[PDB]
Design a protein around this ligand. Structure first.
Ligand code: F43
Ligand code: F43
Ligand SMILES: C[C@@H](OP(=O)(O)O)[C@H](NC(=O)CCCCCCS)C(=O)O
Ligand SMILES: O=S(=O)(O)CCS
Ligand SMILES: O=S(=O)(O)CCS
Ligand SMILES: [Cl-]
Ligand SMILES: [Cl-]
Ligand SMILES: [Cl-]
Ligand SMILES: [K+]
Ligand SMILES: [Kr]
Ligand SMILES: [Kr]
Ligand SMILES: [Kr]
Ligand SMILES: [Kr]
Ligand SMILES: [Kr]
Ligand SMILES: [Kr]
Ligand SMILES: [Kr]
Ligand SMILES: [Kr]
Ligand SMILES: [Kr]
Ligand SMILES: [Kr]
Ligand SMILES: [Kr]
Ligand SMILES: [Kr]
Ligand SMILES: [Kr]
Ligand SMILES: [Kr]
Ligand SMILES: [Kr]
Ligand SMILES: [Kr]
Ligand SMILES: [Mg+2]
Ligand SMILES: [Mg+2]
Ligand SMILES: [Mg+2]
Ligand code: NA
Lengths: 558, 433, 264, 558
């Protein structure tokens, strides 16, 4: 099993940022260069000059920064994507500037999973139709013509440009191998091929049963014009059209409404449910996304289950970006936003170092993945050791502390390392959650500081609500999400929670955390974003080498 | 069982050795009456209706619908309109319907009959029966017809039903609409702190009582006061909100001249130790003493009382509401450091206070203390032990806030200032025993 | 008679923590009223205190038993605006750490609104009260003028490498060294002031480590401060247990496991 | 005044579609060409071939249409934008294919109006600051640097690429001419210059008063990644940052929270409020858009108020596309959607003919704009004449009936012509609404048909709810919108309602319908979409000559 090395995992990035620097030195010379030190800020300044000239109105200007100083009175440092060679400027990781991050969220939002059994039962019961591999095959062709916005029944219909909706498609999947084998493989998610490791395919098929599902991905351009609430409705409309065609129904009879109810509600599995009024949102938005579902969308677990830390930290990268940068930093606020609150969790190999250290500590003290006692005492031991080690790293390497310059970043990374260690060791998300809050409490007393003004609302509520069973307090971590009351507001937590939810099921060597339908749906390589290697995709977006869906070049001038 | 001595807002003893169950939301007739009162009572802004019609500013927010002014003067006909509203909503002669003109005709106090609440599922019948009765009364009084009455209806009901609430309307409640509930049982939690300060007429002891009662009524409806948790919640209600054993009053008085958050912490610990609620557990090598709670729910109740007294001493000294967020945070942070026992609601008051401090000092949302409530995403997390302090802080403020009770809740003051349960809640609860 | 103990721990850092909490902090320097007022930037030295509302005696107050037994601070009686001081403290052994600045305020001063963050710590109070609290903090051993400073905005630097001359990084360079003394010539939000506030000599490195409340590897190692770790563990455990059920039986509920402590 | 001419306004489009055709012929030869007759369908088929080849999965294919027929067994005809020379294929007016349509909606969704008086009162009361034209000028510079996503206070911030957010800006406006003239004109919406016709400027300044307001337009790319609920929050965040810098406040003190509550709530004027749970949506989404606000966004009224019909039909074009194509046809459903349900109202000059006929009828019978009796008798007369005339046009011109081939299209256009005529004649939106339902009822008995299966839910509830004053039935039309209960579901009404809300205030020669702040905000020519000539913009989008905001070409590979 894993052996933690003698060189800290974060040293490479420090050397690549500071060629020749003695990493123990606590002082540095400040040259106060301002923005001209940095190619990206200079490019932005020039871009703002063009913007203002073109529109007749001042826009971006570094000199508007207060105090007569521009950004960069200290050194502005770049970011290495963890486990990647790519080093990028920090602005390259802002979600607005990074099409890989935008497409990951669009791929989530435009997805709905819809059962077929209820629809087939309706056709049998009400119409006396026989459902066969051949009728299903005809349906799958119909729905992949209609779903992107094309016509199958009426005359003189106008349609979406197929090139604007090239990312839209429907595949079916099922625990019934006999049926999966009778359908043209272009229309099927092959569970057996995608989940060949550690018997994962047989776990998924047993959890799904001999039931049939559709993974529907509506066009990116549609959710960009509209919202996540569009997804289940759009899916259902074209599912309905396709059943009408494929089973020679009346194009609008009572039985069609039964198919609609099944597709919209009774057999529909949303990515996320709606939110209360204060933060009113349609379904399929990030506030409604549970940590179990988020963890199950990430696919590193099917690639290398033998290294539970890698998948865990890919989940952290997925969740922290989505929940902090896009959800909290835009949907719930906006502006410059919260890029580096999240980058701390997926750059410069910092969390990796702290977490592999913990993994090795647990392996040697408690035993293999998932075997540690599921109790408060164990959470206490692992969280304290992992937090103290990480604090010592920040204390011993001044440029590491300077990287995670905000206490909120340090708190989330120290606590994520602690909870991910505990989850992998114990295989229990809820015990890991006790470890998360322990880390916060240990951290606060060491340095007399933790995060921003409002960082530990959930953390002071935290320990007592891990094992509450009261109505609005108690909840297992897999089913908590960004609308769990204590979690509804603040950066530096939600994506980390997803991460160590994944860590507990990785430690237990499970095939998924919360819903096998989600797991299979997002394993499909036909999605635009590669859910199996999050941080590699983020690097592509930051380097302007990621091609997203939803652009309108086909229908605009130049 | 548990017993408490009940004390009034001036620290005078009312009743001795009262069974804790006798002040329960499920048993105490005064608490039941207070709930019924806030559910069925609404205020009508006749001046606002008159203004909206005369200026065609239906819906508010600078809206103006040119040409659709309706020239009516309901503030000059307030007695006649009040009589018609009463006739339209009263179910039976001599029932508890009340309709009263206030402000010389500018406002109407409308206590809708309890039967209309009983006959429904929620609490909105007071709002809706009053809005409808008023619309009809205006239509009849001013001989309105087919195409102008819809505009007058919007003067009353606001933009309902394009919106789910009566946005920009002129029928007011201290409650919100049910769809604003964050979760199950949250309607009585959704009472703006500025409203609570006006219900109490800025008497901070009565504000603690009114706010604490309604918060714990909410918690009971949420299902979070069952079994052992009933005793947990009832002790917090009694000691933080109902001045049980005069602890909040006395701790505030003894720390009112020179005291601080920290001296109230020390007094709370000393009282807990003297009363046997806590004891020394172990002593560390440095001499630091770890305490243990001999009665866990009672230790929480002492921390809840101390949190409130700390709010009264610190916000009282500042004569400013904003310090309540830090008072709740640091009272409980430091009582834990002083004892190695968990603070009020086992960190949930401290946690509420962390986020409440943030969202009352940052760009991201929130506002001054007066805009928060037990249903607010920021301040919902303690089961009733944080908001009463917020309301008290709002009541103690001498004029530092932008959105003050007078600016957002003036009609609330007038509507309830003659209602006995709100004028003397502690005496009423004791008398109901 | 209850004697406060404030905080566990036996190291000299824990002793310093209890000093800050208890207000037993030594005066190391003098800052004149006019200098402090110029640095705070809320009014000209010598100007009358502006108002946010009339004096209490002039407008009267509602009939409230709490108001009638809680004495207003001088600033509240006067109607002052609520203003602030805000400090940033280096993690390289500044004497103060944010939470203990807030405990100092909350224990030792009336009518204050302290706020703790990682890179800033704020005290809001009525202006004249705020000034007195800031004077006490800035003149005391809680402050080194190189490792700590008044920063009402643009606070970046608590976690950064110190400048070569020992000054905490300040993007606005509100302070700088002249002949061994720290000089402040901008107010706390970066506006130049028409005076040079001489805050005196910085703490030596050794002095900072003798006076600091922070634990770190080059001073008092946190890992060795078992009493504090015990305290953290005990509070976490009891919070966890009582959230499940608020009763003594919860302390041995299934799932607690073999919890153990170092010093008790 | 207007004189209705001898040749029907729709004849030009018929002759341009059918060169040489005798327009009285009821019969036609069908050649059953299929899709090969149509260049756009041929292009779509080739696009689908590329899509399938690039992704390895079937997508668009005309041959999947049921029955062994492809689209075009009849002639597939193009559409003329009314009042424009531009004739386009029908697919060019699908919202997915039409960037002008997408940007009109994005421009509304990304707008919030925020008062400045409460914030200035906060600075005076709590900080004792003086607010001057000079301090406001510094604030306006700060907010136009920060609002697109750039930094003003902190150090080591990462920022949005100014070129991706070039559409984001903030302007102030006020009824106080003395202040408006003291601020650099690039930051000010000049009410006097934009509203120079029929004294509209003085009406707007009187209705706004000596109050100061900000028109905030957040980046298109943000609402495309996120939703309309982002707008008021994003705006408030950067407003707060700009006040902190412009008034030397503590970067995070109690008074900043007062500015946040003002910017987010107390002084915030949303374009639309939230919706109930079944159709859960954030604020600033189309379901919450009132008809009065929709009509006030359209700016033809300030250009040519002497022709109230032109502005009215531009509002129809704005609303029918938004509510039917984007809102009901996507947000609330999806697929091929509802393009032609809406194009019937803004193409081929049909509604224009029917409405100008009505205008002329009313002018000669009742007198000038806005002077007809505000009563049910008058609505009955106008609606019946306008509807009969339109029905006779469809009966006398077979290709006109063929254009509006669905009854729902005919119902909406006949009723809109009826209600717009009534609104212009009476000056009263509520009376016009009685005429709308009258048209439906007349129409139904003439032809024994009206619309689709569920077209006249609101129309049979219609007449009786015009003059109801009951809680969830009574409401003035200006404040009704797409969440008024009867209206919450069905195509072919909402944009028409907005249209004749506009018609009533145009007939009264008002400067706006419902909110003067909305009216001034959307007059600003710095918006991407030209709200003063809706149908000309749609033509540009259909011809691929409209440049939208929000594209990502700067940060993606080729
Ligand atoms: C004005 C506030 C109060 C508030 O409500 N938000 C602010 C500012 C806001 C702005 C700053 C943008 C700008 O510079 O114009 C943004 C970007 C949010 C936005 N509006 O887009 C932000 N903070 Ni803040 N904010 C941050 C942080 C922080 C840290 C920074 C401390 C340090 O030593 O530098 C401290 C809180 C703390 O002490 O723990 C902090 C405070 C503050 N934060 C203080 C300003 C502090 C100052 O005067 O310099 N932020 C961080 O700790 C890291 C992440 C960083 C965020 C940007 C990103 O994630 O990339 C940014 C997140
Ligand atoms: C299957 C339904 C039942 C239902 O729930 N929706 C349907 C079909 C649906 C599909 C048809 C797409 C396709 O052809 O594959 C779409 C485009 C919605 C979607 N899923 O994207 C649509 N109708 Ni329909 N639907 C329409 C209409 C109509 C008219 C068409 C009558 C005629 O004589 O052609 C009739 C209703 C009526 O008689 O009033 C109608 C019915 C029907 N409509 C019958 C199919 C009728 C048939 O078998 O041919 N629609 C219209 O009346 C005009 C606008 C048109 C819509 C597309 C657009 O707006 O461009 C389309 C709107
Ligand atoms: C509190 C609440 O704001 P209001 O008080 O309702 O204005 C809520 N904002 C938030 O929770 C903002 C969270 C994201 C920004 C801060 C991240 S720590 C919201 O807009 O619905
Ligand atoms: O300074 S605050 O903690 O309010 C915000 C940090 S982004
Ligand atoms: O045929 S139906 O009226 O149900 C649908 C028309 S799009
Ligand atoms: Cl230097
Ligand atoms: Cl129990
Ligand atoms: Cl007990
Ligand atoms: K969107
Ligand atoms: Kr790096
Ligand atoms: Kr970028
Ligand atoms: Kr077509
Ligand atoms: Kr289905
Ligand atoms: Kr989601
Ligand atoms: Kr723990
Ligand atoms: Kr492990
Ligand atoms: Kr601390
Ligand atoms: Kr009220
Ligand atoms: Kr100073
Ligand atoms: Kr197209
Ligand atoms: Kr940066
Ligand atoms: Kr504002
Ligand atoms: Kr909108
Ligand atoms: Kr007319
Ligand atoms: Kr009919
Ligand atoms: Mg060395
Ligand atoms: Mg192994
Ligand atoms: Mg004229
Ligand atoms: Na030890």
């Amino acid at each position: 099993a894993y052996k933690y090395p003698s060189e800290k995992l974060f040293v490479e990035a420090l050397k690549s940022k500071f060629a020749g620097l003695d990493l123990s030195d606590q002082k540095v010379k400040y040259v106060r260069a301002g923005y001209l030190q940095n190619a990206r800020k200079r490019e932005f300044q020039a871009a703002g000059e063009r913007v203002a000239e073109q529109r007749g109105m001042q826009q971006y200007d570094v000199n508007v920064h207060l105090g007569g100083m521009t950004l960069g009175q200290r050194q502005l440092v770049p970011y290495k994507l963890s486990t990647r060679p790519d080093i990028v400027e920090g602005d390259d990781l802002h979600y607005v500037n990074n099409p890989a991050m935008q497409q990951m969220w669009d791929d989530m939002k435009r997805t709905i999973i819809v059962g077929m059994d209820l629809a087939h039962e309706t056709l049998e019961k009400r119409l006396g139709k026989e459902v066969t591999p051949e009728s299903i095959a005809g349906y799958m062709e119909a729905v992949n013509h209609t779903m992107p916005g094309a016509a199958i029944v009426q005359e003189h219909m106008v349609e979406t440009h197929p090139g604007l909706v090239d990312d839209c498609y429907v595949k079916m999947f099922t625990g019934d191998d006999e049926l999966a084998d009778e359908i043209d493989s272009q229309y099927v998610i092959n569970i057996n091929d995608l989940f060949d490791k550690e018997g994962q395919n047989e776990k998924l098929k047993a959890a799904i049963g001999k039931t049939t599902w559709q993974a529907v991905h509506i066009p990116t351009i549609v959710v960009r014009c509209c919202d996540g609430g569009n997804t289940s409705r759009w899916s259902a409309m074209q599912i309905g059209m396709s059943f009408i065609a494929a089973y020679n129904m009346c194009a609008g009879e009572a039985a069609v409404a039964d198919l609609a109810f099944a597709a919209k509600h009774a057999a529909a599995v949303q990515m996320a449910e709606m939110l209360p009024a204060r933060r009113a949102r349609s379904p399929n938005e990030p506030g409604g996304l549970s940590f179990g579902y988020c963890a199950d969308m990430v696919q590193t677990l099917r690639v290398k289950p033998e290294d539970p830390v890698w998948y865990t930290l890919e989940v952290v990268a997925c969740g922290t970006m989505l929940y902090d940068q896009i959800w909290l930093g835009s949907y719930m606020s906006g502006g410059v936003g919260f890029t580096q609150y999240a980058t701390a969790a997926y750059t410069n190999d910092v969390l990796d170092d702290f977490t592999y250290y913990g993994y090795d500590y647990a392996l040697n003290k408690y035993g293999d993945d998932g075997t540690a006692p599921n109790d408060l005492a164990t959470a206490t031991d692992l969280a304290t050791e992992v937090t103290l080690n990480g604090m010592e790293c920040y204390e011993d390497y001044p440029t590491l502390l300077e990287d995670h310059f905000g206490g909120s970043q340090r708190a989330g990374i120290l606590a994520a390392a602690s909870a991910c260690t505990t989850g992998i060791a114990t295989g229990n998300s809820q015990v890991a959650l006790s470890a998360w809050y322990m880390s916060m409490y240990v951290h606060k007393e060491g340095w007399g500081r933790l995060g921003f003004f409002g960082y530990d609302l959930q953390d002071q509520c935290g320990a007592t609500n891990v094992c509450s069973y009261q109505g609005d307090e108690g909840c297992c971590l897999e089913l908590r999400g960004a609308n769990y009351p204590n979690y509804a507001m603040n950066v530096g937590h939600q994506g980390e929670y997803a991460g160590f939810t994944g860590s507990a099921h990785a430690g237990a060597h499970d095939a998924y955390c919360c819903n096998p339908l989600i797991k299979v749906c997002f394993a499909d390589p036909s999605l635009v974003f590669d859910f199996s290697y999050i941080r590699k995709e983020y690097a592509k977006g930051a380097m302007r080498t990621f091609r997203p869906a939803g652009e309108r070049s086909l229908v605009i001038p130049a | 069982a548990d017993t408490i001595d009940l004390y009034d807002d001036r620290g005078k003893k009312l009743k001795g050795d009262v069974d804790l169950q006798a002040v329960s939301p499920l048993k105490n007739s005064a608490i039941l009456s207070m709930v019924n009162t806030v559910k069925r009572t609404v205020a009508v802004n006749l001046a606002g209706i008159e203004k909206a019609c005369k200026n065609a500013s239906y819906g508010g927010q600078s809206r103006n619908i040119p040409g659709r002014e309706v020239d009516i003067d309901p503030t000059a006909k307030a007695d006649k309109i009040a009589a018609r509203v009463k006739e339209l909503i009263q179910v039976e002669k001599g029932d508890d319907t009340e309709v009263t003109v206030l402000g010389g005709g500018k406002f109407l106090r409308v206590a809708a009959p309890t039967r209309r609440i009983e006959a429904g599922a929620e609490y909105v019948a007071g709002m809706t029966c009053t809005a409808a009765a008023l619309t009809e009364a205006l239509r009849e009084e001013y001989n309105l017809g087919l195409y102008d009455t819809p505009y007058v209806k919007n003067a009353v009901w606001g933009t309902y039903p394009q919106t789910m609430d009566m946005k920009g309307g002129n029928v007011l409640s201290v409650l919100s609409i049910p769809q604003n509930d964050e979760g199950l049982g949250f309607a009585l939690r959704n009472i703006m702190a500025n409203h609570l300060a006006m219900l109490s007429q800025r008497n901070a002891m009565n504000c603690a009582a009114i706010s604490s009662i309604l918060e714990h009524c909410g918690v009971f409806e949420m299902g979070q006061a069952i079994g052992l948790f009933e005793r947990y919640q009832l002790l917090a209600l009694a000691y933080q909100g109902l001045n049980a054993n005069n602890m909040v009053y006395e701790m505030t008085k003894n720390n009112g001249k020179t005291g601080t958050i920290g001296t109230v912490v020390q007094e709370t610990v000393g009282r807990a130790l003297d009363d046997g609620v806590i004891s020394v557990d172990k002593t560390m090598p440095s001499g630091y003493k770890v305490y243990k709670a001999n009665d866990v729910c009672m230790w929480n109740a002492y921390c809840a009382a101390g949190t409130m007294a700390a709010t009264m001493v610190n916000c009282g000294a500042l004569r400013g509401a904003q310090a309540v967020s830090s008072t709740l945070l640091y009272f409980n942070d430091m009582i834990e450091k002083e004892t190695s026992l968990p603070g009020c609601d086992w960190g949930r008051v401290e946690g509420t206070a962390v986020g409440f401090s943030f969202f009352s000092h940052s760009i991201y949302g929130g506002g001054g203390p007066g805009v928060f409530n037990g249903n607010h995403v920021v301040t919902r997390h303690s089961t009733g032990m944080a908001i009463p302090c917020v309301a008290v802080a709002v009541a103690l403020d001498a004029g530092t806030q932008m959105f003050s009770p007078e600016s957002t809740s003036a009609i609330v003051l007038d509507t309830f200032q003659d209602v006995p349960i709100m004028m003397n809640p502690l005496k009423e609860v004791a008398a109901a025993v | 008679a209850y004697t406060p103990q404030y905080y566990p721990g036996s190291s000299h850092v824990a002793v310093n923590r209890r000093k800050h909490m208890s207000g037993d902090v030594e005066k190391l320097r003098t800052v004149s009223d006019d200098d402090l007022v110029a640095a705070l930037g809320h009014r000209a030295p010598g100007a009358d205190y502006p108002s946010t509302h009339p004096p209490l005696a002039e407008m009267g107050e509602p009939d409230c038993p709490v108001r009638q037994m809680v004495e207003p601070t001088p600033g509240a009686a006067a109607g002052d605006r609520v203003r602030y001081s805000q400090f940033t403290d280096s993690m390289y052994s500044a004497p103060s750490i944010p939470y203990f600045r807030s405990y100092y305020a909350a224990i030792n001063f009336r009518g204050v609104d302290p706020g703790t963050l990682s890179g800033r710590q704020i005290v809001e109070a009525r202006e004249r009260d705020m000034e007195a609290q800031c004077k006490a903090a800035i003149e005391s051993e809680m402050t080194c003028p190189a490792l700590a400073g008044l920063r009402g905005c643009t606070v970046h630097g608590h976690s950064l490498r110190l400048a070569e001359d020992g000054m905490m990084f300040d993007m606005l360079q509100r302070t700088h060294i002249e002949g061994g003394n720290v000089i402040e010539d901008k107010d706390q939000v970066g506006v130049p002031i028409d005076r040079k506030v001489n805050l005196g000599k910085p703490m030596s490195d050794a002095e900072a480590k003798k006076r600091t409340t922070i634990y770190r590897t080059d001073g008092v190692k946190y890992r060795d401060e078992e009493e504090v770790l015990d305290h953290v563990h005990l509070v976490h455990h009891r919070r966890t247990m009582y959230g499940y059920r608020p009763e003594t039986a919860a302390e041995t509920a299934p799932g607690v496991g073999p919890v153990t402590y170092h010093t008790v």
